[PDB]
Design a protein around this ligand. Structure first.
Ligand SMILES: C[As](C)(=O)[O-]
Length: 100
């Protein structure tokens, strides 16, 4: 695996709001990745991209509606990172997650 990996599980049913992810990295870096998940024996990916601001921060927002009903697990992945990048937190549905 060449990706930096962050597993998650979700409700199979609730699709309100956003899946919001906080990344911390090199200021002004450029970055991309996905929210990946298994759906009926396929690995599906919702791509994200963005740059860190001058504080090293990048907030990604993906509508929950992009994940099919019935999906209950997946992985946030970092693909390209021009400098350093890590996920610190995500919020999806009622789950407020901090990555120690
Ligand atoms: C509420 As937790 C253990 O996912 O940061």
């Amino acid at each position: 695996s060449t990706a930096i990996l962050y597993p998650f599980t979700i409700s199979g049913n609730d699709r309100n709001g956003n899946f919001t992810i906080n990344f911390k990295g090199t200021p002004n870096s450029t970055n991309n990745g996905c929210i990946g998940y298994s759906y009926n024996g396929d690995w599906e990916k919702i791509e994200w991209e963005g740059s860190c601001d001058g504080n090293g921060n990048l907030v990604v927002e993906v509508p929950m509606s992009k994940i099919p009903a019935g999906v209950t697990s997946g992985e946030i992945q970092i693909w390209w990172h021009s400098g350093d990048l890590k996920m610190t937190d995500y919020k999806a549905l009622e789950h407020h997650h901090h990555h120690h």
